[PDB]
Ligand binder design. Structure first.
Ligand code: 3HE
Ligand code: MG
Ligand code: MG
Ligand code: MG
Ligand code: MG
Ligand code: MG
Ligand code: MG
Ligand code: MG
Ligand code: MG
Ligand code: MG
Ligand code: MG
Ligand code: MG
Ligand code: MG
Ligand code: MG
Ligand code: MG
Ligand code: MG
Ligand code: MG
Ligand code: MG
Ligand code: MG
Ligand code: MG
Ligand code: MG
Ligand code: MG
Ligand code: MG
Ligand code: MG
Ligand code: MG
Ligand code: MG
Ligand code: MG
Ligand code: MG
Ligand code: MG
Ligand code: MG
Ligand code: MG
Ligand code: MG
Ligand code: MG
Ligand code: MG
Ligand code: MG
Ligand code: MG
Lengths: 205, 51, 100
RNA sequence: AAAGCGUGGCCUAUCGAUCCUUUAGAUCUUCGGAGUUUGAAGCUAGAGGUGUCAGAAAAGUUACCACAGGGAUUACUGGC
RNA sequence: GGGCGGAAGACAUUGUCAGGUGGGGAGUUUGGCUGGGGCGGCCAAUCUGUUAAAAGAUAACGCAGGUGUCCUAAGAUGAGC
RNA sequence: CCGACUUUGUGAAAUGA
RNA sequence: AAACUUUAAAUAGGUAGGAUGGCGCGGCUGCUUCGGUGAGCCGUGCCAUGGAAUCGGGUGCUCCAAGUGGGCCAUUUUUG
RNA sequence: UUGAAACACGGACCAAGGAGUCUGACAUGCGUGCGAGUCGACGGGUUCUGAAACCUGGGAUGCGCAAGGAAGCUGACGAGCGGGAGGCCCUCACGGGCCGCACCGCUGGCCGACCCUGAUCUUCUGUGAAGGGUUCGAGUUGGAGCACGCCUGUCGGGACCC
RNA sequence: GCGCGACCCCAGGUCAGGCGGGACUACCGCUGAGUUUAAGCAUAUAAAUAAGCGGAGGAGAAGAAACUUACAAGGAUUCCCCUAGUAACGGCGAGCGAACCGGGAGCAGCCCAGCUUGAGAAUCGGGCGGCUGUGCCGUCCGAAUUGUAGUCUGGAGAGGCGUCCUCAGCGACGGACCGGGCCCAAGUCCCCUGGAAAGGGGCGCCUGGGAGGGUGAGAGCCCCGUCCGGCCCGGACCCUGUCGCCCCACGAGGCGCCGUCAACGAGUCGGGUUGUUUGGGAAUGCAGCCCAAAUCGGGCGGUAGACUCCGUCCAAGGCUAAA
């Protein structure tokens, strides 16, 4: 090594020329995926091309906790309260995720509105030709059915930037927000030291 | 025997230009289509085109 | 239980959502012993007998030296969590054989 | 008494990196689900030592020898 | 007489750990300076005087020598001599 | 080379608990 | 008398030869003094014929980097 | 090589092949686009010669816009001076004054680490009016950065060739 | 002086059947180096690689949480981007180095064992026979009660009540996908050089066809071809499109309630020690030996330890395209 330069981190001491992966087939995968999507669309005509319905859920992880995304499936609670049986939901284009847990009414009603919307704008062909059973749909509106393409129920990733204009009140000015914000940090630090003295306060007195 | 430093498939074949720089270049090319002296310099026989 | 404080840092920090009580699931009874499995295990227990270290546990408990009872039970089984409850189970066997 | 003198020896030599261990100190910081609580991990300042002393952990032989080289380098001749 | 005939016998032995021995064997090293190298020595850290040519710097396996310590006083201060 | 655990079961005595 | 010196060359060595100076006035100081006594600074106003000779645009500032790190000859001083 | 015509080594001659290339990271310099932004690079839709081209997302993906600490954590409360390009004003002009970018030098302030300090207020352990520091920062008191290309250099890869 | 039944094991050129070897790109398992780098070298690195030994398919492997996380939490597997040359690991030297989150491609979840016909093996195979023939049916043997079929799989489930809601097959005709064959525009006009006109001049034509190739020299128009499509033949079809006859139940499912049961995989987990491996650090996986479970329990929450609480999942059986 020589004149002032970063300390190298070349991870090329193995036989990397046996494992170079080149991307010359990138246009090829694009075109093959496109072909596969056409031939799935024609087969699942007239089902929606995005597939079954997906829930609005929150991400994990402090960095993205506020940013909603499509999940994997509706929970059993949600299907039950929207009035759609467990074994029937995957049939009619509704995913089911028996592993999720509903921890909030805010989440449950948010997805219940999606179940109701999907059932509102859902059409179901009869299993046979003339026999129209319960849960079916009438021929007169069956006859205009199309294959919706793309995302038919979009999810907003963050709540919209809205900044209204309001009064600045006197008791709002008096609020020492930093002092507030240090007090609970102090309490979190002292949480053990407080409860210990409480424990022996009970144990002795 | 070999060639020196044999040619390898993982050269940089495709180079990248900024999307906005492509757009700027297409703007300059469209502008240059409009100037009769530029077309005639560039090698097109235009002595009878109307406008 | 009750929701977060709504303040980004501190005791019970986080963002406020009206929390919910989960319906009972299967696998919350996971491990809850049942009538017939208890019947089976209790029956087979005396038919098979007691493993030798478990007999040593019985001896040390009926002497009353619970510390060494736990110690040898731990050295046989492997971890304190299961040594403790093995000692509890064998103390149960000694109360149910000194009951009569 | 005071001015002052005193940050070792009247002055010029008499000594020591990284990692590891160990000690001193804060009623210090972390063990990342939350606490009590041993242990461990830190920060600052010392010691444990490298004498080849800017600091690898290290015995010979080859006349059975080998490869790279050297006329930077010996033995023969030549030269002063 | 439901024991093929003897012997040894829960000891040898089998497997896993544990310690010692183990150039039989493996892997590896075997510093530098140097009027060639080797042996010698340290001119490898380092101090004083000289060489050093009256500022500083200045070499040789140049020269005469020194250092790996000793000290609760042989440190600090004051006083007297 | 030897030590322990294992295959490794049975009952008997003498010394320690 | 290289490891002696009172004295003590020549040659070479350092510094200075102004505009980055000086004076007056009124302000600050937690320094300093017995003290406007100093030391230093700050604002302001005045002066300062360029303060020896000669010569001339400058590494003046910065960056990136090559090669080199075996030297040899000569006059003088000089070690074995 | 200090030194080659050397009694130093290679070369009998001809023809053809023959030795600093490619890739990754980084950096300076230069060019282009945008510029507190900048990248569409993995995907998606298109694409009537096309592995091209064009469109799309990004509301936070990379880097940049905040740094100091080991960490818990905290996180810039708004700058003056000397010399200065250049412009301006006055004078007949010589000369004088004003504003003075860049850069250089000097002194500070603020953030943070460590130390020091402590009115009030407060959830009693927190805050922090005032005051700090021969300390330390790859800080701030200048937003200039991102992407692409080229050369050069360092390093990893056969890595100039034998 | 026996005839019996079971077990276990023989021999059969018995009847019917499956195995072995080959190819190496990619894929799965074991085994497993050093040259090199560290300016030496011994841990490290090369590398969990090359070589060795095996096993498959059109893909293989994985796969439906004994997961991550600490969030407002999410939710099988696989791959790409980012995470990230980062946390960590390392004679803390050389170097080495993942994961969560997020965005995308594609997304499908399933079935067993166990308590559960006991008026009653309801199950399966084989020989023979028939027919409509990848099967169905009858008869006779055998397997099997040391358990075949059915119900169940934790998201549950089994029971009991209920208005209720949901289930069937066979034809035709295409489309779609695949292969193959045939066909398809226009100068060879006049002059000149030329061995040869495919060249030059002149007069013209095609073009949804000026890709390419042949033909005696730079051929759109001589030829095969290219564009537009047309026609016909054959396949697999098991995908859907509409027509037609066949009319869906007292069985099963779904939904609502109940509260009673609620059965869940062992030398396995788990622990010690050793070895290897990892980024995994008081130990990441695996493996050997020893110890060896639990049912108000068990595995995790990236620092060993005990107590309290909390978040989370249910292993030790199996199948599963797509990217
Ligand atoms: C007895 C101990 C030995 C030595 C140290 O352990 C050797 C280390 C240091 C080093 O160079 N890297 C290593 O891996 C070895 C040290 O520090 C001394 C003070 C005292
Ligand atoms: Mg003093
Ligand atoms: Mg003294
Ligand atoms: Mg002194
Ligand atoms: Mg030391
Ligand atoms: Mg933790
Ligand atoms: Mg040295
Ligand atoms: Mg040797
Ligand atoms: Mg011999
Ligand atoms: Mg040897
Ligand atoms: Mg030598
Ligand atoms: Mg010698
Ligand atoms: Mg001199
Ligand atoms: Mg001198
Ligand atoms: Mg002088
Ligand atoms: Mg020579
Ligand atoms: Mg000669
Ligand atoms: Mg030579
Ligand atoms: Mg020759
Ligand atoms: Mg951005
Ligand atoms: Mg200025
Ligand atoms: Mg290179
Ligand atoms: Mg290599
Ligand atoms: Mg090496
Ligand atoms: Mg080397
Ligand atoms: Mg070597
Ligand atoms: Mg191989
Ligand atoms: Mg498979
Ligand atoms: Mg980064
Ligand atoms: Mg590795
Ligand atoms: Mg034709
Ligand atoms: Mg012609
Ligand atoms: Mg042709
Ligand atoms: Mg191995
Ligand atoms: Mg291990
Ligand atoms: Mg599988």
């Amino acid at each position: 090594v020589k004149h002032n330069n970063v300390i190298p981190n070349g991870h090329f001491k193995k036989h990397w020329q046996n494992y170079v992966k080149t991307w010359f087939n990138q246009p090829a995968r694009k075109q093959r995926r496109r072909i596969a999507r056409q031939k799935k669309a024609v087969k699942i005509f007239p089902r929606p091309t995005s597939g079954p319905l997906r829930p609005i859920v929150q991400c994990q992880t402090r960095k993205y906790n506020m940013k909603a995304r499509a999940g994997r499936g509706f929970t059993l609670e949600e299907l039950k309260s929207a009035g759609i049986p467990k074994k029937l939901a995957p049939t009619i284009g509704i995913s089911v995720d028996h592993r999720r847990k509903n921890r909030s009414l805010e989440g449950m009603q948010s997805n219940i509105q999606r179940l109701k919307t999907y059932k509102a704008k859902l059409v179901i062909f009869p299993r046979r030709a003339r026999k129209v059973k319960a849960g079916d749909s009438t021929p007169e509106e069956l006859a205009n059915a199309t294959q919706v393409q793309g995302d038919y129920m979009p999810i907003a990733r963050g709540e919209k930037r809205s900044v209204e204009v309001v009064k600045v009140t006197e008791e709002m000015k008096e609020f020492k927000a930093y002092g507030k914000l240090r007090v609970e940090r102090m309490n979190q630090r002292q949480l053990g030291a407080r409860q210990k003295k409480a424990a022996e306060a009970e144990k002795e007195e | 025997g070999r060639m020196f430093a044999p040619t390898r498939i993982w050269r940089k074949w495709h180079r990248r230009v900024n999307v906005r720089l492509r757009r700027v270049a297409v703007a300059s090319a469209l502008a240059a289509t409009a100037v009769p002296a530029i077309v005639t310099a560039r090698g097109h026989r235009i002595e009878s085109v109307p406008e | 239980s009750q929701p977060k404080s709504g303040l980004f840092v501190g005791i019970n920090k986080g963002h406020v959502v009206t929390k919910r009580e989960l319906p009972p699931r299967p696998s919350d009874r996971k491990g809850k012993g049942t009538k017939r499995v208890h019947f089976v295990r209790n029956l087979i227990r005396e038919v098979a007998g007691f493993a030798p270290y478990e007999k040593r546990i019985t001896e040390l408990l009926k002497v009353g030296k619970d510390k060494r009872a736990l110690k040898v039970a731990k050295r046989k089984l492997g971890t304190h969590k299961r040594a403790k409850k093995k000692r509890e189970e064998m103390s149960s066997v000694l109360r149910k054989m000194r009951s009569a």
